[PDB]
């Protein structure tokens, strides 16, 4: 298809495991619609301990990964990836992802991540080796790498061939037609499509309205949907 | 320790060794820190094929995940859990982690993480099942697990022995002593611990500001962060 490469430096590839053997993405690497490489810092190392971290200039608690074998790992990569692969650093001082980020990330034939563990690295490999910077959320983990899977993940989705607007999904029912006395919404039974649509489109617009009107700010709602959030504006009052 | 136990629900539960065998995450677990045991709905099926998807009411392209084996495996966690565990299912519809929901989300000594596949779960599951919806992240991803882990890991650092304020990290260096041209600040290495710290503090209140300057507002600066802010704003001016 219009496949994807995407280069992983970490010290511990056999996480992605998590996304290459199972799922969506799973299928999508055994059919070569994703190709997924890494390259383990411990492995360009030199001295007997294979030692990966390193001190922080100016004290403090924690260590940083050490520069040289990660510098020669994502040299490594960038060989192997050829020209036009963009550098990503993960990390919570980058752009917040979005589905608007994923989208734009995804425009890319080659990727390389970078996955920081310890406490990170070093400034002067960000402004020499990484072209973009990317949070995946406002929080802190103990590593960089979920949150290349989860960038992996989102991306892989706009792959041709890998799946078989700005709202909130709506509710979803599958049988039983009674479950625990709640029954399903009768115009899901209708087989009236139309209203079928205009219903699950309803059920957003007022989903989005209650839990995330922030959301509702970015968009300019078609006549339809303004007319459908008023009723449900309406209806809920 | 002030160990943690989280009971997941998951049509692929061995993408949680990714967490459960290697780092920080992976030691807790073999340190009795933190617990993490998995359900399959597969397991909780009793047709021939071992169906666990099913048809939504009303049409549309995907599937969900179907009602009887998930809500099986669900009870059969909560049975296991005994009382006091909070069930919560990872969606885009659920409130946005960040790291102050991660703090309240580590005050649980138990949780259960329901982990979607397909295209969602019964919305009467969720009102008859799960305590809390919570979101990772505004994007899509193709199953809940990787949500799973990444509140797993966040909230794995809060447990006492796991390890060894608002604004963005300051910038980390490690040897060697100059990289591409590029030198390490001379106040990192000048030993003066208050230098050090008043200067880290500069650059996150410099870097929020610059990146991120709306998590500024949501903040009562100290009159040691105003005044360092008011210089970094007058020096990059
Ligand atoms: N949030 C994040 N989006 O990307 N990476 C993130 C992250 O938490 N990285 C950790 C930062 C602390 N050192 C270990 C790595
Ligand atoms: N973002 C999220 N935060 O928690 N789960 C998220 C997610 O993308 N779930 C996918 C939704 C589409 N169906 C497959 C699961």
Same mark, same amino acid.
């Given at each position: 298809?219009?496949?994807?490469?995407?280069?992983? *430096?970490?010290?511990?590839?056999? =996480?992605?495991?998590?996304?290459?053997?199972?799922?969506?993405?799973?299928?999508?690497?055994?059919?070569?619609?994703?190709?997924?490489? /890494?390259?383990?810092?411990?492995?360009?190392?030199?001295?007997?301990?294979?030692?990966?971290?390193?001190?922080?200039?100016?004290?403090?608690?924690? =260590?940083? =990964?050490?520069?040289?074998?990660? +510098?020669?790992?994502?040299?490594?990569? @960038?060989?192997?990836?050829? %020209?036009?692969? @963009?550098?990503?650093?993960?990390?919570?001082?980058?752009?917040?992802?979005?589905?608007?980020?994923?989208?734009? !990330?995804?425009?890319?034939? @080659?990727? *390389?991540?970078? /996955?920081?563990?310890? %406490?990170?690295?070093?400034?002067?490999?960000?402004?020499?080796? *990484?072209? %973009?910077?990317?949070?995946?959320?406002?929080?802190?983990?103990?590593?960089?790498?979920?949150?290349?899977?989860?960038?992996?993940?989102?991306?892989? &989705?706009?792959?041709?061939?890998?799946?078989?607007?700005?709202?909130?999904? /709506?509710?979803?029912?599958?049988?039983?037609?009674?479950?625990?006395? !709640?029954?399903?919404?009768?115009? !899901?039974?209708?087989?009236?499509? %139309?209203? *079928? +649509?205009?219903?699950?489109? @309803?059920?957003?617009?007022? &989903?989005?309205?209650?839990?995330?009107?922030?959301?509702?700010?970015?968009?300019?709602?078609?006549?339809?949907?303004?007319?459908?959030?008023?009723?449900?504006?309406?209806?809920?009052?």
């Amino acid at each position: 298809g219009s496949h994807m490469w995407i280069g992983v *430096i970490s010290l511990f590839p056999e =996480m992605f495991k998590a996304i290459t053997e199972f799922g969506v993405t799973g299928r999508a690497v055994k059919h070569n619609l994703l190709k997924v490489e /890494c390259w383990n810092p411990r492995d360009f190392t030199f001295d007997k301990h294979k030692t990966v971290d390193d001190r922080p200039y100016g004290g403090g608690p924690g =260590m940083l =990964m050490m520069v040289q074998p990660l +510098r020669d790992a994502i040299h490594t990569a @960038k060989a192997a990836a050829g %020209e036009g692969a @963009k550098v990503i650093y993960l990390s919570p001082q980058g752009r917040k992802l979005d589905q608007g980020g994923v989208t734009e !990330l995804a425009q890319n034939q @080659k990727l *390389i991540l970078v /996955c920081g563990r310890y %406490e990170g690295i070093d400034e002067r490999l960000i402004q020499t080796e *990484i072209d %973009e910077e990317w949070s995946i959320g406002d929080y802190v983990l103990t590593g960089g790498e979920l949150p290349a899977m989860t960038l992996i993940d989102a991306v892989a &989705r706009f792959i041709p061939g890998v799946l078989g607007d700005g709202l909130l999904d /709506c509710p979803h029912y599958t049988r039983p037609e009674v479950l625990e006395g !709640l029954t399903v919404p009768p115009v !899901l039974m209708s087989g009236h499509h %139309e209203e *079928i +649509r205009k219903w699950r489109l @309803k059920q957003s617009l007022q &989903r989005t309205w209650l839990r995330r009107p922030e959301l509702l700010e970015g968009l300019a709602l078609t006549d339809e949907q303004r007319k459908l959030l008023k009723e449900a504006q309406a209806e809920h009052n």
